[PDB]
Structures are given as C-alpha cells and as structure tokens.
C-alpha cells in the first residue's frame, strides 16, 4: 500500500507515535517519506552486508526482524520480516517504537540525519488535522 500524506499522519497519531521517546509526528513522517515514499511493500537488499530493509520504515533484518538469510542477525522486534510488508502498519509501528528505544533513537536511520535533522519538517503534517 502507498499511503497518501495526511492519511498516514492521522494513522500514526492514532497508533501513538506523536512524541514517542521525544520524537514528533512530523519527524516520523519525514522518515517514512525518505525511506520508502510511504510504501509498505518497499524492499531493499543491501548487497554489501547481506541484510535487507523492509517496509514503510525500511527496518533492517540484521537487528530487528528475522528473514532467515541474514548472517549473524538478531530479531529484536520478535517478528518475521514478512510482517513489515503488510498494508496494516501496526506491527511496523510496534517495531519502529522498539528501534528508537535504543540509545541512538531516531538517528538509527541515516536518511533521517541527511534529510530531516535540523530542518523545518512542519511541511509533512501541515493541513492533515493532527
Ligand atoms: Na534478523
């Protein structure tokens, strides 16, 4: 599923993402926009280290979900990576919350630093009613 901007914003708020571990809703929107273009079925294989990024938040298989083919991987979210490709983003959101509970927080995603950090991210939620 490819979410429309405001549809996703309202969904994330309902799932309790606004201010989770100090992260504003607009930052989560900026992250999903740059990681997958708000696409839940996005999959990106990283030839360099044999890991794969899954879903709307492009969660990595080495630490967060299990896909069985990633060497020395752990499954911190206790989820099959398949769960992160569903149209319903409840599991992806629960796993994203787990990722940010680690010391790095939202910085765990390099795209966030490149495209969202220290920027005016209000644009991602303007007019959505959140
Ligand atoms: Na894994």
Domain assignments of the chain as residue spans, ordered by start: 1-130
Question: Cα–Cα distance between 35 and 84 in angstroms, integer?
Answer: 14
Cα(77) to ligand 1 centroid in Å equals 9
Is residue 59 a contact partner of residue 74, using CB atoms and an 8 Å limit? no
Q: Are 28 and 17 in contact (CB under 8 A)?
A: yes
Method: X-ray
- Strands of the sheet containing 59-60, edge to edge, are 43-46, 51-54, 59-60
Q: Is residue 62 a contact partner of residue 74, using CB atoms and an 8 Å limit?
A: yes
C-alpha 5 to ligand 1 mean position (Å): 29
* Dist. CA 67 → ligand 1 center (Å): 6
Stated in angstroms to one decimal place, the resolution of this structure is 1.8
**Which residues sit opposite 2 in a β-bridge?**
39
DSSP state of 59: E
Question: Which CATH architecture best describes the domain 1-130?
Answer: Orthogonal Bundle (1.10)
Residues catalogued as catalytic: 35, 53
Rounded Cα distance, 129 and 119, in Å: 21
CB neighbourhood size of 24 (10 A): 17
Residues 6+ apart with CB under 8 A from 16: none
Who's near 78: CB < 8 A, 6+ residues apart?
Answer: none
CB atoms closer than 10 angstroms to residue 13 = 17
**Residue 100 Cα, ligand 1 centroid: separation in angstroms?**
17
Whole-number Å distance between alpha carbons of 115 and 1: 23
> d(Cα 3, Cα 19) in Å, to the nearest integer?
21
Secondary structure (3-state) at 39: strand
Per the document, the length of the chain is 130
Cα-to-centroid distance, 28 and ligand 1 (Å)? 23
Distance (Å) of CA 99 to CA 4, 63, 103:
24, 9, 9
CA distance linking residue 64 with residue 80, whole number of Å: 9
Residues with CB under 5 A from ligand 1 (ion): 61, 66, 73, 75
In 10-66, beta strands by DSSP E: 43-46, 51-54, 59-60
């Amino acid at each position: 599923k490819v979410f429309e901007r405001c549809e996703l914003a309202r969904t994330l708020k309902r799932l309790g993402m606004d201010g989770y571990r100090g992260i504003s809703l607009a930052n989560w929107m900026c992250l999903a926009k740059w990681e997958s273009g708000y696409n839940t079925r996005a999959v990106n294989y990283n030839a360099g280290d044999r890991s794969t990024d899954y879903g709307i938040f492009q969660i990595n298989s080495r630490y967060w979900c299990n896909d069985g083919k990633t060497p020395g991987a752990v499954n911190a979210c206790h989820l099959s990576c398949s769960a992160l490709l569903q149209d319903n983003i409840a599991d992806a959101v629960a796993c994203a919350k787990r990722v940010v509970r680690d010391p790095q927080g939202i910085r765990a995603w390099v795209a966030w630093r490149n495209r969202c950090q220290n920027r005016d991210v209000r644009q991602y939620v303007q007019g959505c009613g959140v």
